[PDB]
Design an enzyme around this catalytic site. Structure first.
Site, PDB file in Angstrom:
ATOM      1  CG  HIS A 128      18.875 -24.200 -43.552  1.00 40.36           C
ATOM      2  ND1 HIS A 128      18.450 -22.905 -43.343  1.00 40.36           N
ATOM      3  CD2 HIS A 128      17.773 -24.912 -43.888  1.00 40.36           C
ATOM      4  CE1 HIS A 128      17.149 -22.836 -43.557  1.00 40.36           C
ATOM      5  NE2 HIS A 128      16.713 -24.037 -43.888  1.00 40.36           N
ATOM      6  CG  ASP A 151      20.753 -20.376 -42.685  1.00 40.60           C
ATOM      7  OD1 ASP A 151      21.353 -20.995 -43.596  1.00 40.60           O
ATOM      8  OD2 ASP A 151      19.618 -20.694 -42.273  1.00 40.60           O
ATOM      9  CB  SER A 156      14.187 -23.078 -45.368  1.00 37.71           C
ATOM     10  OG  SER A 156      13.403 -23.926 -44.573  1.00 37.71           O
TER      11      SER A 156
HETATM   12  O1  C2D Z   1      14.534 -24.543 -38.393  1.00 35.30           O
HETATM   13  C1  C2D Z   1      15.508 -25.278 -38.268  1.00 35.30           C
HETATM   14  C2  C2D Z   1      15.858 -25.862 -36.933  1.00 35.30           C
HETATM   15  N1  C2D Z   1      15.072 -25.552 -35.836  1.00 35.30           N
HETATM   16  C3  C2D Z   1      15.183 -25.984 -34.415  1.00 35.30           C
HETATM   17  C4  C2D Z   1      16.062 -25.018 -33.581  1.00 35.30           C
HETATM   18  C5  C2D Z   1      17.482 -24.989 -34.092  1.00 35.30           C
HETATM   19  C6  C2D Z   1      18.354 -26.078 -33.945  1.00 35.30           C
HETATM   20  C7  C2D Z   1      19.662 -25.988 -34.469  1.00 35.30           C
HETATM   21  C8  C2D Z   1      20.106 -24.833 -35.132  1.00 35.30           C
HETATM   22  C9  C2D Z   1      19.235 -23.747 -35.280  1.00 35.30           C
HETATM   23  N2  C2D Z   1      17.937 -23.845 -34.768  1.00 35.30           N
HETATM   24  N3  C2D Z   1      16.915 -26.655 -36.826  1.00 35.30           N
HETATM   25  C10 C2D Z   1      17.762 -26.978 -38.028  1.00 35.30           C
HETATM   26  C11 C2D Z   1      17.447 -26.459 -39.237  1.00 35.30           C
HETATM   27 CL1  C2D Z   1      18.412 -26.824 -40.625  1.00 35.30          CL
HETATM   28  N4  C2D Z   1      16.317 -25.586 -39.377  1.00 35.30           N
HETATM   29  C12 C2D Z   1      15.936 -25.004 -40.691  1.00 35.30           C
HETATM   30  C13 C2D Z   1      14.807 -25.854 -41.337  1.00 35.30           C
HETATM   31  N5  C2D Z   1      13.631 -25.146 -41.943  1.00 35.30           N
HETATM   32  C14 C2D Z   1      13.132 -23.854 -41.431  1.00 35.30           C
HETATM   33  C15 C2D Z   1      11.826 -23.927 -40.665  1.00 35.30           C
HETATM   34  C16 C2D Z   1      11.083 -25.052 -40.302  1.00 35.30           C
HETATM   35  S1  C2D Z   1       9.761 -24.672 -39.464  1.00 35.30           S
HETATM   36  C17 C2D Z   1      10.013 -23.049 -39.517  1.00 35.30           C
HETATM   37  C18 C2D Z   1       9.251 -21.967 -38.982  1.00 35.30           C
HETATM   38  C19 C2D Z   1       9.726 -20.621 -39.164  1.00 35.30           C
HETATM   39  C20 C2D Z   1      10.945 -20.372 -39.882  1.00 35.30           C
HETATM   40 CL2  C2D Z   1      11.567 -18.775 -40.124  1.00 35.30          CL
HETATM   41  C21 C2D Z   1      11.682 -21.458 -40.405  1.00 35.30           C
HETATM   42  C22 C2D Z   1      11.205 -22.783 -40.214  1.00 35.30           C
END
Ligand code: C2D
Lengths: 11, 251, 27
Positions: free
Chosen positions: B43, B99, B199
């Protein structure tokens, strides 16, 4: 942006 | 990283920064698994819902870094990408299942005090160490909170692996066998999470059998950062190891 | 072959400040 410019050789 | 601490020098010599050429900015974390191969989250490279689809020429890899923003002359090494490989069954449409992505560097990198590869787990190490309550370590230059903003230097936090039922019950997202979750429970007292910018970075564990560091996970997704009752989700590296070996063996 | 062994820690038999936290969790 608030990153220091890297050497042009890598760009 | 939320509720982490500054890394020690050379504490994570496999840590890689994925860096956009223009504008010059941090995109994601990543990890060094050999002199020419870097592992990250798919991603970080491809996510159509946000019009994200980077090509080789868009990006650089910066290896051996400590400071987030400064050019660490005589220490970091900056490398160009030869080829990106994304898991063919990476599910960006639904839940970010599988991923994972590999990046081949144009030239091999020289190892140093600050640059050294992490191990990928064999079946037996994975089986022994991927257990609820067992702690791993996550590192990155991502946000210090969900909304200081960014760190001056690499951040580190140690987090316990969470039981599958608790992971599943924390979210409406469909969880798969290619994912695990980690973090403290609301009652446990201690806190911490990955956040945006972390990420693609590694979740590592130190094997008590051979004293080597293994990358068990890749920072994949979460809902917010360090919220009570929520957990960070990580790509289960061993489960996708056959794809990893195939790509490295072939290309 | 040399993977996972850090020049400034394992290679010198030095521990980092919190790795013991991980070891202690492996019960
Ligand atoms: O996270 C997400 C995310 N989170 C919401 C829930 C969903 C929705 C759609 C698919 C998968 N999960 N959606 C899409 C994407 Cl592309 N994504 C990756 C972005 N960065 C990672 C991240 C942001 S805050 C946070 C806190 C902890 C971890 Cl491990 C990772 C992260």
């Amino acid at each position: 942006g608030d990153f220091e410019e890297i050497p042009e050789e890598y760009l | 990283i939320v509720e982490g601490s500054d890394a020690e020098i050379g504490m994570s010599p496999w840590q890689v920064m994925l860096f956009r050429k223009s504008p010059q900015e941090l995109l994601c974390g990543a990890s060094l698994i050999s002199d020419r191969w870097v592992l990250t989250a798919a991603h970080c490279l491809l996510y159509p819902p946000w019009d994200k689809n980077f090509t080789e020429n868009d990006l650089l890899v910066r290896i051996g870094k400590h400071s987030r923003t400064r050019y660490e002359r005589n220490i970091e090494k900056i490398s160009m990408l030869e080829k990106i490989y994304i898991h063919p069954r990476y599910n960006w449409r639904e839940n970010l299942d599988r991923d994972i992505a590999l990046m081949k560097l144009k030239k091999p990198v020289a190892f140093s005090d600050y640059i050294h590869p992490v191990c990928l787990p064999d079946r037996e190490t994975a089986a022994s160490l991927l257990q609820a309550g067992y702690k791993g370590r996550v590192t990155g230059w991502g946000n210090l909170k969900e909304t200081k903003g960014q760190p001056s230097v690499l951040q580190v936090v140690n987090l316990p692996i969470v039981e599958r039922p608790v992971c599943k019950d924390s979210t409406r997202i469909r969880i798969t066998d290619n994912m695990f979750c980690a973090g403290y429970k609301p009652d446990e007292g201690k806190r911490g999470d990955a956040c945006e910018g972390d990420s693609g970075g590694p979740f590592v564990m130190k094997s008590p059998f051979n004293n080597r560091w293994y990358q068990m996970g890749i920072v994949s997704w979460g809902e917010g950062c360090d919220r009570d009752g929520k957990y960070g989700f990580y790509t289960h590296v061993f489960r996708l190891k056959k794809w990893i070996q195939k790509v490295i063996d072939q290309f | 072959a040399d993977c996972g062994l850090r020049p400034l820690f394992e290679k010198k038999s030095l521990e980092d400040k919190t790795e013991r936290e991980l070891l202690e969790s492996y019960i």
